[PDB]
């Protein structure tokens, strides 16, 4: 169903839908691991389905249509605790300290670390690191072996804590677009 921001479980999958209060976002949970999101001149939002908690060896399958008009991501997205880390395995996007590269699931990814200072998080306002793997060959369907990225990050000194949630997420930032994604 079309829902308001929050977290919960739908048809066997965890979901998270978050936004900054700037209107123009319609997020809808579908059957199974399916979700769809339409946004018209939104602020910042993140929504998608997956698992609570994730694992450090999950192979994540996704397929769908992803048509952003501006700043947006389509990512394997999640959190860890102790250390508090918000991480991205970016498979596609619309319109940082580089640490290395990894070749995984048919593409080279570029690995980055950023720091968020006094920003929202799963534990409230906090300062924390973000880990990124940005796919070079952009795509909106395929499989992600998360262990390839987590191990590559660790080899560069990027440590993950105990896993919190782990989803395939569509994120937008002051843009418009449409997406419909099925996770498995």
Q: What's the CATH code of the domain at 97?
A: 2.60.120.180
Phi, psi of 100 (to 5 degrees): 165, -165
- The pair of three-digit structure tokens given for residue 102, joined into one six-digit string: 């990894």
**Residues before each break in the chain (C–N > 2.5 Å)?**
95
How far, in Å, CA of 112 to CA of 9, rounded? 31
The DSSP result for 104-152, as a single string, is ETTEEEEEEEEEEEEE--BTBSEEEEEEEEEESS--SEEEEEHHHHHHH
How far, in Å, CA of 117 to CA of 107, rounded? 31
Q: Are strands 141-145 and 34-39 parallel, antiparallel or unpaired?
A: unpaired
The resolution, in angstroms to one decimal, equals 1.9
Give the determination technique. Answer: X-ray
Beta bridge pairs of residue 39: 25, 177
* Beta carbons of 177 and 94 less than 8 angstroms apart: yes
Radius of gyration over every alpha carbon of the chain, rounded to an integer in angstroms: 15
DSSP state of 5: S
Q: Is 16 helix (H, G, I), strand (E, B) or coil?
A: strand
Q: Is 153 helix (H, G, I), strand (E, B) or coil?
A: helix
Alpha-carbon distances, residue 98 vs 7, 88, 140, 163 (angstroms): 32, 14, 24, 23
How far, in Å, CA of 49 to CA of 17, rounded? 9
Phi, psi of 28 (to 5 degrees): -135, 125
The pairs formed by 26-29 with CB atoms below 8 angstroms and a separation of 24 or more are 26/2, 27/2, 27/3, 28/1, 28/2, 28/3, 29/1, 29/3
Residue ranges making up the domain that contains 78: 2-184
* Beta carbons of 18 and 47 less than 8 angstroms apart: yes
* Beta carbons of 61 and 184 less than 8 angstroms apart: yes
Instruction: Measure CA 143 to chain center.
Output: 14
Catalytic residue numbers read 86, 171
Q: For the chain, how many structural domains are there in total?
A: 1
Longest CA–CA span in the chain (Å) reads: 41
- The pair of three-digit structure tokens given for residue 104, joined into one six-digit string: 């995984």
How far, in Å, CA of 26 to CA of 100, rounded? 37
Q: Is 46 helix (H, G, I), strand (E, B) or coil?
A: strand
């Amino acid at each position: 169903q079309t829902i308001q921001p929050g977290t919960g479980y739908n048809n066997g999958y965890f979901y998270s839908y978050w936004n900054d209060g700037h209107g123009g976002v319609t997020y809808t949970n579908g059957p199974g691991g399916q979700f769809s999101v339409n946004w018209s001149n939104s602020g910042n939002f993140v929504g998608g389905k997956g698992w609570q908690p994730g694992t450090k060896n999950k192979v994540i399958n996704f397929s769908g249509s992803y048509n952003p008009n501006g700043n947006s991501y389509l990512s394997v997205y999640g959190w860890s605790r102790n250390p508090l880390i918000e991480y991205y395995i970016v498979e596609n996007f619309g319109t940082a300290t580089k640490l290395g590269e990894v070749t995984s699931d048919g593409s080279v990814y570029d690995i980055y670390r950023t720091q968020r200072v006094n920003q929202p998080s799963i534990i409230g306002t906090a300062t924390f690191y973000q880990y990124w793997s940005v796919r070079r060959n952009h795509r909106s369907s395929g499989s992600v072996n998360t262990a390839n990225h987590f191990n590559a990050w660790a080899q560069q000194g990027l440590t993950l804590g105990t896993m919190d949630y782990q989803i395939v997420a569509v994120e937008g930032y002051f843009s418009s677009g449409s997406a419909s994604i099925t996770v498995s």
